[PDB]
């Protein structure tokens, strides 16, 4: 029984163990709760976010603990209950999302153990915590941190309650760390060091101090046009990131003026299938302007792209993020500082156009500061879909500035991100970034004109 957990023996309203995989927190807590039940007539609620069947709960772990220590003859074991025959202590097992009503009605709970608590949503906490209201009752929590902004992390680490005993552990704190897990761990440490730190050292995902777009801006910008009462006006712009020859999904983004309407991923496609997919989406979206990344495997797509739009007045622009910024000799607008003095290249230029729109939108939504909707950006959540919106947000928050020896704004490249961060190429984020750019001049009545 790892001495690190000794503080959980003392009385505290909150006992929270956070750590990486194989750290021993589950075995330690099960052991302590079993020893408590042997000695006090405690009612113990074992809760989790989702319990689709009893096998998803800790009941088996508790049974194994009982048998391991040789306490079997002291207990009654049923499908969904464990009871001590001497104290009448009782364990019960419920999923919060499954049985919210049952949970609210439970009486006399002395200890609540929330396991796998990283999955527990704010709404679940808000249901569960008020029910554990007996004087001297305790809430025990074990979790492997996910994102620093997830409720469980915010609730117990960043903005903690009174009387919390917080322990942080990892596999190095587990004197019984088994070989099978050690092998997985060392394998991971070598293959993906960043992932290893998250999984095995229990470090939550959080924003780099070099990140350019904050999660909270993206949350505010979600349906900002509904929140603030404006609607989409402008051209429809679509963009395609053809990715590479690797596994990473291709990307597509489309907006109608300041309202983003579609974020799509292209899986198991070659370069031509991907271009066909993306140009078809652009047509379906009624695009006036289409861009695609020409810096890599996309450099040869011009003919297929313009062919796909034949007969339709849709501009087609090859975006090369490595090029000097668009309009680089023009004055920069937030002796004269030019756009070219500020941005190293187009990739930086348009990622900052995106970030600037998002920040303005954030200040409008959250701080009530006025801004022209044309300068904002809103995500139409119903149109895009929660699933793809979340995928996009997870990529956008990883886009990082890097040091630049001429004091220009420059971002880590997709290749660098994969190498350093151990993540797939952020192709949805790049597709969205590219649709920030509108270099082709057009009118219903006129030619397409591409100044340069
Ligand atoms: N007190 C102990 N005695 C014997 N073996 C232990 C003990 N504590 C941990 N272990 C072993 O270490 C392994 C991991 O412990 P766990 O408690 O399951 O860690 P964990 O932090 O809950 O892992 P995650 O986040 O579930 S993968 C167990 O499967 C046991 O094999
Ligand atoms: Mg565990």
Structural notes for this entry:
It is classed as viral protein. Keywords: ATP-r-S binding, Magnesium binding. The assembly is monomeric. This protein is an alpha/beta fold. It has two domains: 1-207, Rossmann fold, CATH 3.40.50; 208-452, 2-Layer Sandwich (Nucleotidyltransferase, domain 5), CATH 3.30.420. The chain has helices at 25-37, 59-69, 100-105, 122-128, 151-158, 179-191, 193-199, 215-221, 224-228, 271-284, 302-308, 339-342, 346-367, 381-384, 386-396, 414-421, 427-434, and strands at 14-19, 43-48, 75-78, 81-84, 90-95, 111-114, 138-143, 164-169, 236-241, 250-256, 259-266, 289-293, 315-319, 378-379. The strands form two sheets. An eight-stranded mixed beta sheet has the order 3-4-5-2-6-7-1-8. Strands 13-12-9-10-11-14 form a six-stranded mixed beta sheet, with helices on both faces. Helix 15 (386-396) packs across helix 17 (427-434). It binds phosphothiophosphoric acid-adenylate ester (AGS) and magnesium ion. Phosphothiophosphoric acid-adenylate ester binds next to helix 1. Phosphothiophosphoric acid-adenylate ester is lined by residues 1-2, 19, 21-27, 144, 174, 176-178.
What number of structural domains do the residues give? 2
Q: What is the strand content? A: 15-25%
Question: Which ligands are bound?
Answer: phosphothiophosphoric acid-adenylate ester, magnesium ion
The structure class reads alpha/beta
Which strand order does the major sheet show? 3-4-5-2-6-7-1-8
Main sheet attributes: strand count, strand direction, barrel closure: 8 strands, mixed
Using the CA coordinates, give the radius of gyration.
27 Å
CATH class of the largest domain: Alpha Beta
- Work out the helicity level: 25-40%
Number of strands: 14
Q: Give the termini distance in whole angstroms.
A: 72 Å
Q: Given the structure, what is the number of helices?
A: 17
Do you know the CATH architecture of the largest domain?
A: 2-Layer Sandwich
Q: Based on Cα principal axes, name the global outline.
A: elongated
Q: At the third CATH level, what is the topology name of the largest domain?
A: Nucleotidyltransferase, domain 5
PDB class: viral protein
Keywords: DNA packaging, terminase, ATPase, Magnesium binding, viral protein
Assembly: monomeric
Entry title: Crystal Structure of the large terminase subunit gp2 of bacterial virus Sf6 complexed with ATP-r-S
């Amino acid at each position: 029984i790892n001495p690190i957990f000794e503080p959980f023996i003392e009385a505290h309203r909150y006992k929270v163990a956070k750590g990486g995989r194989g750290s021993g927190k589950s075995w330690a807590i099960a052991r302590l709760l079993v020893e408590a039940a042997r000695r006090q007539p405690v009612r113990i609620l074992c809760a989790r976010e989702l319990q689709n069947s009893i096998s998803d709960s800790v009941i088996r772990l508790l049974e194994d603990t009982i048998e391991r220590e040789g306490y079997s003859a002291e207990f009654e074991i049923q499908r969904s209950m464990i009871r001590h025959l001497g104290t009448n202590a009782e364990f019960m097992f419920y999923g919060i999302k499954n049985n919210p009503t049952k949970i609210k009605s439970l009486e006399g709970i002395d200890i609540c153990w929330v396991e796998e608590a990283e999955a527990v949503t704010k709404e679940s906490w808000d249901i569960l915590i008020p029910t554990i209201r007996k004087p001297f009752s305790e809430i025990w929590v074990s979790f492997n941190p996910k994102n620093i902004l997830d409720d469980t992390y915010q609730r117990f680490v960043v903005n903690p309650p009174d009387d919390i005993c917080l322990l942080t552990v990892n596999y190095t704190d587990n004197p019984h760390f088994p070989e099978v897990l050690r092998l997985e761990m060392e394998e991971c440490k070598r293959r993906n060091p960043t992932l290893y730190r998250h999984i095995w050292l229990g470090e939550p995902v959080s924003a780099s101090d070099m990140a350019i777009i904050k999660r909270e801006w993206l949350e505010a910008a979600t349906d900002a046009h509904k929140k603030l009462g404006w609607k989409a006006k402008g051209a429809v712009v679509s963009a395609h990131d053809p990715s590479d020859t690797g596994p990473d999904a291709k990307g597509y983004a489309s907006r109608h003026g300041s309202v983003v309407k579609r974020i799509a991923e292209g899986l198991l496609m070659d370069i031509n299938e991907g271009a066909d997919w993306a140009t078809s989406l652009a047509i379906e979206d009624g695009a006036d302007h289409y861009l695609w990344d020409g810096d890599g495997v996309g450099a040869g797509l011009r003919r297929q792209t313009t062919e796909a739009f034949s007969g339709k007045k849709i501009t087609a622009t090859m975006f090369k993020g490595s090029e000097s910024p668009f309009d680089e000799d023009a004055p920069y607008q937030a002796n004269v500082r030019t756009i070219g003095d500020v941005f190293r290249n187009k990739r930086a230029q348009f990622y900052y156009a995106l970030a600037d729109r998002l920040y303005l939108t954030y200040r409008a939504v959250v701080h009530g500061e006025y801004a022209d909707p044309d300068d904002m950006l809103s995500f139409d959540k119903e149109a895009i879909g929660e699933k793809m919106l979340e995928k996009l947000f997870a990529e956008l928050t990883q886009i990082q500035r890097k040091f630049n020896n001429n004091g220009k704004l420059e971002l880590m490249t997709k290749v660098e991100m994969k190498q350093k961060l151990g993540i797939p190429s952020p192709n949805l984020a790049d597709a969205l970034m590219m649709c920030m750019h509108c270099p082709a001049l057009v009118r219903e009545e006129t030619e397409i004109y591409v100044p340069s």
